[PDB]
Write a protein that binds this ligand. Structure first.
Ligand SMILES: [Cu+2]
Ligand SMILES: [Cu+2]
Ligand SMILES: [Cu+2]
Ligand SMILES: [Cu+2]
Ligand SMILES: [Cu+2]
Ligand SMILES: [Cu+2]
Lengths: 335, 335, 335
């Protein structure tokens, strides 16, 4: 191997969490090594018990977030165990050449492959499976998509000469799902992805999802699994959608600094209510919390958010600010 | 009450008009007082006589536009008369905390509540009802949404050191409506919002509206109710959509200065043909008219514009400019 | 005729190619003369033999790209031959007044008209037929749309003081098509546009296309008709959509410089994965190729791209760059 740089192995963590990393760094370029192991599996996606033939990187929807810096090289070992039923590959939107890597990574069950790409573009980017032809959309909407973040070596900035630093980062992957129904309107179950294919493709081509979820299921980022923050903390929220548009919004908050197209060579917009994630992309928003309590993080098609699955919660700790908002008079009879 | 600022009551006006206000101002912060009275009512929405179970702020779709300045406090008395049938509240996208105010403003029929929020973010913003769970999308698409504008104290600018001043402002609220049909394809009628709910929710979840209208009905901003201007006048057009994307366009004109994400801390884009309003947001465009006659203001999904209801007209007064455009030869036989 | 400028006739070429022109120019304003001849015709749109009642400018979908400079006047002779069956006109989004020209250009079969407009706004812009009322969307989605590019006299720039020059330009026109089906689900055929109208309008109002194509048919920009480039060449890709949103992406590449709203008075964004074309607009992206081989140019709703028709190919010549990407280990058994 001609490339004589130091190598470092990083262990991935399951979304919505993100592996430990530096923002600004004094390190120089290195080869950062990752492993992804594909898993086909049947999962429950809603409160009613609907099942779904999922196909995943590393067992999760979305796949895990990789974090590197500009000028690093990213060397991924992609594994397709013999217990899976079909061929898979990987396309990095961050990479240059060979259909994002897809033309160099097609592997049958029982095989693995090693792909390296140079991180020449900064931002958040989708990665997804793309075997060929009609298999491309089917693998993606079955769950085979995640993201990678390529940070500047000096960290993030506001476009006006000031550093932005986040106290924590979360990754919200949004998935449009297509579960067929029978003639009485009930959702269908299947014993393998291959058995689900014909009915699923027929539904896909009509363009209307049955479910729109964060982190793989209705309610995944609520209750015991709500996102957390403190008043005064700056939180970065990375949002991806590999196939279909979304319009994120933080109920009771704002996007203080937003890269809706997701690329750090562009200055952020400021003070947004709602932003726009193009299908086939990742974007990012940073917010400094000012008030404690519950927030909902939604797509602002509210039918999708409340009725099809696309709501997360934040539970924020701290002291209420009565200057920013206050209930002057509680509910009372009309005089 | 700890807050010792002067108070001023402002009377709202029905869309598409906007209450009188200053752009640049020499006044300091004040508490600006507004009242909204909720009205549930059955209305006619198209030329054919289709009826609709609407729920409104102040009797209109959209609710009226509130206009204040950065650093003001906005104190709203929300009234739910005893003649209404269910609970309602209000969520301001301009506000910080308590789900935009929604967690502090839930009122039953026969009750009123008073909410204050500080106007710390500049721009145009949606406000909407949001009672909880599946009621959130249903109240919004029934008509319970409007907007608020928070101006800089120095008025608007172009991002290049020049003031922009408008001669008039209009507010265009766009509403996606879901009217169910029976087995023969005819639109259904109902005697209350509660009776309409089950069939309406079933249709909502399929994501395709039956109607897309401006100012509450097909043709509302046409004919006797066309928008007006003169050649030489600078017109600001505020556009909101609380649930679903839109793509505004002025036929025969342009957006000279456009804030499509709607927030005045960002410089405007210039010289646009068509812009994009994310569902869950307000945006704004300014145009200086150069030619007299009729203009159509549309969403540029032309099926929605011409066939589902989403067309307004401007009738502009003044002298034709033959340098900008001219009919060199009138229709004639092909030689 | 009061206007005393030199006149020059330019011959149009069929998409995706573009007539020869200058970027930066030392010429002053002139009257640039074009001719468009309308053709209604029955065409095959997919691999299966589905037919479609198309209506076109100059025999192509999209209509051809016109290229002029800021301050030119554009004088178009629009011809409606006697072999056509209904009235047509033209609306230029680049023009000011009279519904873009539509109110001055309505012509019956057997007639022609001459319209001039001044090119006061820079960028890429849609042009389309717009006869009136429900005919507007129907003519547009039948194929009656193209684009015009208005270049600055000094050529394009990056917003940071540097010239951008392209080595070639392609025009990709995307068309949403609505082909009705019968009760068994098979696509319907018709003997005239008038006969197709009733069933087509019923389908249009449901908002879901049967086909989404580039250059008028599935596969039009693939195989013998793939787009071409060399490693090291800067390629400008103009994309239009007159009725419905799109999200372009170059698989294995990026948008180095992107004007997604399409207007050259705005600085471009840099280093994009996927961009957004609002329905009713044209946008533009420039990319310098770094790797040889096949690329797919798609809308990144991958169901639309792979299953409904919306994929083009580039075949790029040159030497592989193993620093940017390399296959470290070929597929092998899992140890
Ligand atoms: Cu796969
Ligand atoms: Cu992709
Ligand atoms: Cu309500
Ligand atoms: Cu909201
Ligand atoms: Cu026509
Ligand atoms: Cu148009």
């Amino acid at each position: 191997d001609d490339l004589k740089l130091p190598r470092q192995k990083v262990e991935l963590v399951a979304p919505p969490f993100v592996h430990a990393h530096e923002q600004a760094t004094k390190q120089g370029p290195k080869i950062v090594e990752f492993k992804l192991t594909i898993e086909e599996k049947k999962v429950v996606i809603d409160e009613k018990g609907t099942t779904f033939q999922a196909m995943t990187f590393n067992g999760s929807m979305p796949g895990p977030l990789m974090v590197v810096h500009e000028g690093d090289y990213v060397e991924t070992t992609l594994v397709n165990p013999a217990t899976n039923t079909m061929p898979h590959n990987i396309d990095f939107h961050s990479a240059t050449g060979a259909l994002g890597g897809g033309a160099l990574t097609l592997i049958n069950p029982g095989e693995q492959v090693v792909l390296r790409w140079k991180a020449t573009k900064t931002g958040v980017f989708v990665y997804h499976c793309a075997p060929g032809g009609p298999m491309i959309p089917w693998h993606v909407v079955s769950g085979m998509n995640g993201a990678v973040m390529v940070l500047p070596r000096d960290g993030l900035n506001d476009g006006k000469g000031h550093a932005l630093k986040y106290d924590k980062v979360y990754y919200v992957g949004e998935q449009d799902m297509y579960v067929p129904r029978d003639e009485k309107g009930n959702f269908k179950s299947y014993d393998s992805p291959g058995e689900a294919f014909t009915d699923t493709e027929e539904m896909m081509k009509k363009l209307i999802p049955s479910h729109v979820v964060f982190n793989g299921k209705v309610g995944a980022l609520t209750g015991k699994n709500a996102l957390t923050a403190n008043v005064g903390e700056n939180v970065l929220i990375v949002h991806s959608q590999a196939n279909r548009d979304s319009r994120p919004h933080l109920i009771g908050g704002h996007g203080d600094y937003v890269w809706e197209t997701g690329k750090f060579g562009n200055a952020p917009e400021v003070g947004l209510e709602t932003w726009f994630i193009r299908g086939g992309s990742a974007g990012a928003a940073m917010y400094k919390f000012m008030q404690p309590g519950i927030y909902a993080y939604v797509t602002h098609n509210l039918i999708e958010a409340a009725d099809l699955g696309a709501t997360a919660h934040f539970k924020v700790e701290g002291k209420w600010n009565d200057d920013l908002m206050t209930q002057v008079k509680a509910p009372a009879e009309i005089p």
